[PDB]
């Protein structure tokens, strides 16, 4: 391996992590706000190295390596919970938030970023505008959003839309005050989930593309696909929707150049 | 009485509470900051209607009735403590902040205003820029300020100005973190002391001044002096430092108007 | 005083304290249940000797001297509150229950009897059927019950009968669990308020009457009217509503006998 | 498998769990009560649906599947402890109850049911009738009790069974009050121990016995012996104690019918 | 008033406060040790200037003035209690220590000293050598001890000297741990009660006497009896047991010398 | 296996564990004290018998088997830390002590022995003599000691050798009170480190040295070399640095007798 060749798509616009994180008002956890992120350079070490997030805990990927990876789509799910419920944003965990408000799948790949928000989300006398769903008949499916407001029937009597004995509203207020304990303290949570599935990659890190060298042994990083081999011209006519190539041994022997749209044969 | 005549003097500028309360940085408790406020208009109801002040304790005045009474001079004292010693900013209270950092007289008149500033004065990894005087050979007198950094000799041996065995540095750091408990979270405290000595009033509130009505039994408030009488015209010989006259009964019977310099005979 | 004479009306049915204290379901604190107790004999010893009432606090009446006094009418107010809200059931106290749910007068005469009911009012998973009023525009008057359920306008926008941002339901659930700490455990509260008017006393204790002794110096207890003097047969005519004979000097001169209906002058 | 066939013995007398769980007074933890349950149909639904059991921790068996299985002998160990020491009733923990009062084996197959009993085991002024062994020479063996009252020597002095300096009574009282916290509140604990040997099962659930359908491929459940097969009429001569039968390869190939005492060959 | 003439008796030996306050082992609170301090000089400002004592509350006298007074006798009561029970050592208090172990009179002239002894009295594995009386039929008279060990019958059944159901041992061990809470460390309490009989005082403070100067208007401190006057030779002879000479105004004008034992007359 | 043989070298002197564990004053954790224990007999059972130690965590070796083995060298480390920071003395653990003060290797062979020291290290007025490094530019490598007192720079502003804004002293005083909780409580930690590497072993347990039995099948522990075989004479030419031989199968077949320096042959 004489050289190393990194080829990423030629994109420059930064996708708004600022509008996800530095928003004035977030949403409640029963109505958590999901933003689609695609076609951007994403500097994850801006979020990592900044001393502002108490929890930057990442599942299925390393937080330091996120600049050196490319994902097809990023989902940013922002909401506000209490501190003791910050642990509940994890696969294979139980609680009110995990069962009824926000559920993470067991194959989750992404990061959970939680930081304290006392000055923004508390008020003397109580901040009651952040509600969590307390009552539901069944647990939530992963990434299912439930915003329905129907009176929960906890007994045998029908409720008919009126709260009362054994008939409760499903949404319950946090009631934040700045004098509250650190467990009952407002924490803003943003969950980044990365689609690593077979698709064209849109969100890529700030790594700079190098020029293409052929007919030599080079390490290569084509759109997040890492390998070592000899890149040459290929007579393989790719159909325009195809990015990779593959053989009977299930090995990537052909890739499409992200920039020049050139099909390169990877001879090992 | 028929109507009330409130006479406040011709003052146009506002009292500078803005850099007292909304400053970017506050000083520490050992170097507690003091601002002298005089000769302006102060609207205390803005501070009273705030939804962020957790503690608004007052002494010698009512927390409702502070705006209508108007004062000689306002001493605004600003410092950052943590939440446990907010009770130590009370008169007669004993503690490390009370004995060694900031001591209030037992006859203190004014209001203590404190609010949590965890999003401002705490950083992830620790904020150590706010210090308190842990050691002093004598307890502080009321309202004295000690910023000396001399090494507190706690043993018999002279160690000559270095930290070591029983040779402690007098200041120590709070060490604020955003994940700390509410006792160990930063609280910005602004003591607002007011003196009520025999002097003409310099700070008075946003209450409007009404026109004079003479020769009729009216309730009057002549710039802090409230009475009932038939405010007739005068022929008195008031020297220009004489705010209000007296008599053999030691009762107020002649007041010179603050807005026109006209002496008025009070007759009940 | 040679002898002691006690005359109480010949009433024999017990007061229904068993219906008050041993009811299966107590109402919520916002809808506290008042029962009027009159025309019976009240045995307060069964309340006092039994050891389950953790809080037994009487105001204006000595708690061990409940039996000898006679009362006109008794009001028993029953409800369920959490453990830290028990101290607010007292004259002159403040809190959410005192302001918005149940306010005692500052001149309150009677007892507060609170006992733990964790077995009867908590189920595993949460008992959400006990609600307290959390939002009100103004504090309650003494002995005033508010069961209104209109949406509380916290902000400047009209609520229009729907819960949402800055519009809250005034009632909030306790959510009792048996694993919750004693601050957050159910306590059943019965407040006995005795009124002592100029009306004839109907609620009298279990003290038994003696025979009347006339023309001799005795110490008498005439239906709660204690005193000492020579009871003599009188020619005074009382009208049927009149029960005793206060003179021009406002001292009791004659008493109507509560059993035989006899007019009895008191000499000293 | 066309259908499911379940054959259980026709025992209809219900197992005495009412005497275990609803006894008027339990025993102290040093003298914990053990009851032998056998030869009855057991209903575990009344334990699971009940909303008073705060702890239902089952080791080795699924708590929902207690109703499904059959056992031979059930050991019910009932006692009263305090809340913080409920966590000591589990296989493999330490503490005063685990070491000196009640030890659970590491191979424990059974459930632990703990519920709060503040209404029944606490008295205002203290309930000191519940004792625990505080001092012992060596830690207890599993399922061993020590009701001995011998004065524990904690020094080097033979003090002849008299309490005093370094000679302590082995048993110490709890002293339960309703105002005490949940760490120091009474919890009644019933430990159910199921033993499953190579023995005929006497403790089973209320699952109904269906009619005998032979010569068809059925799922079958013969007295807890689950499987799938084509049950036919046999010619094997089982001895009366011999319940099922095994082939050369130690697989169940014949069973006796629990109801009609008939030998049925299980061919697959 | 030129110069004071302090005359205190020529007492040679210091009071044994060191043996009381510095003893190795203190007695338990049910069997507290009382020591009679008399015929000596006692420095009380040594105790105050030492900062080891957490509590120094003195009732009926000020702690700083104690070196200036001659008391007739001193009683030193030393015991070990819990921290939360330290407040029970006060005149007019309720609790287990006040009712059953150590009762202070309401007319108390003395000082209460309490210092933490987690270092010397606590021990890992438990120090159960300190016991307190938990059960008694009646409350204690002031300065009364109970060393009885009879079984407290709390039911109808007799006990026959055997512990069991409703029969409890009167004394319960404390169980001191070094890992206990702030209310549960051992505290050693010395109660110094100053007997002030109208007698020759024998416990005097450390004040250097001044030789007698007569026939001039001087201050004097004769045996703690402060006064101002002219001291003259006395014509009358007082009885050998009687020192104070009272007048019609109940003021001493004829005092015996506490060094040369001769009568002196005080005149204005 | 007829006769067990234990051959240890003839080492007479006892190890100085008294001067390490029972030292009067320990060093602080930034300047932790390392003592080299070699060429003595060590009794670790008497370390294990004491119940004063609240943590006796041994990593890689079991505490019961400590007397069995032999070591070449022992590293006895000693320091004082608070109770919450005891857990950071562990392999593969993070914290202030682990990063900045004392780091164990990830594969550590030895025992962490920590006991509470409230009685020895606390004093009234606070013991601030114990300091810990709170600020460092880089994390400590394992078994590396840093005693630098250079002022740590946090901001871009140079410190210039004085304490100030964003320039802190790297060492912080603990502040131990006798009234502190168990979290801030002084704990004395000794970390014994053992090397299991093959060398002439100098420190061994108190096991008795048996005689030499030859030409009989015996168990043997030759300086901690456990095995079973028929120990016969050898003609192998062991050099002085060669202590135990090995065969072509890499098994121990010839061991030098530690007492005699005589070469013996293991034969199974
Ligand atoms: C949010 O704003 C702050 C400004 O104080 C900035 O430092 C931070 O980087 C911003 N975060 C994002 C994600 O843009
Ligand atoms: C950018 O990429 C596109 C294809 O995605 C390609 O057609 C174009 O030539 C590239 N431009 C440059 C300057 O590399
Ligand atoms: C403004 O102030 C001056 C002096 O303070 C006073 O004489 C004058 O009357 C005031 N102006 C008005 C319009 O009253
Ligand atoms: C500080 O700034 C906020 C920003 O809205 C303002 O509402 C508040 O009144 C300011 N405080 C003072 C004392 O002016
Ligand atoms: C409630 O019922 C119990 C039954 O055990 C009884 O002891 C108690 O006296 C009753 N309460 C009243 C107020 O009578
Ligand atoms: C009972 O009281 C009534 C009046 O309330 C009276 O008429 C009647 O005589 C009394 N009974 C007796 C036996 O005195
Ligand atoms: C105990 O009694 C209650 C009374 O309703 C009943 O619901 C419960 O099922 C009983 N417990 C058992 C184990 O049968
Ligand atoms: C019930 O079972 C027994 C054996 O357990 C059997 O002898 C008896 O016949 C059965 N009864 C019926 C009605 O089948
Ligand atoms: C000391 O006191 C005695 C009486 O107790 C007295 O007789 C004697 O004179 C005194 N000593 C002096 C030096 O005055
Ligand atoms: C107890 O001993 C210490 C040790 O020197 C001493 O400082 C203290 O003064 C003594 N206390 C008394 C009352 O003598
Ligand atoms: C420390 O001294 C005590 C004194 O009794 C002794 O028991 C203990 O064994 C000593 N510690 C060690 C580690 O030997
Ligand atoms: C002790 O061991 C040495 C070798 O380590 C040996 O030379 C010496 O003779 C031995 N002494 C005794 C008394 O066994």
Residue numbers in the entry:
A (entry chain C), B (entry chain F), C (entry chain E), D (entry chain A), E (entry chain D), F (entry chain B): 322 to 589
Paper text:
The Delta and Kappa variants of SARS-CoV-2 co-emerged in India in late 2020, with the Delta variant underlying the resurgence of COVID-19, even in countries with high vaccination rates.
Each RBD interacts with two RBDs in the opposite trimer via two distinct interfaces, henceforth referred to as RBD1 and RBD2. Additionally, homo- asparagine-asparagine and glutamine-glutamine hydrogen bonds at positions 440 and 506, respectively, and a backbone carbonyl oxygen–amide hydrogen bond between residues 372 and 445 further contribute to the RBD1 interface. Additionally, two homo- glutamine-glutamine hydrogen bonds are present between residues Q493-Q493 and Q484-Q484 from each trimer. This latter interaction at position 484 is of particular interest as it is uniquely mutated from glutamic acid to glutamine (E484Q) in the Kappa variant. Given this unique substitution and the unique dimer-of-trimers phenotype seen only for the Kappa variant spike (and not for Alpha, Beta, Gamma, Epsilon and various RBD-mutated spike trimers), we identified position 484 as likely being crucial for S protein dimerisation. A focused view of the Q484-Q484 hydrogen bond shows the bond to be sandwiched by proximal bulky F490 aromatic sidechains.
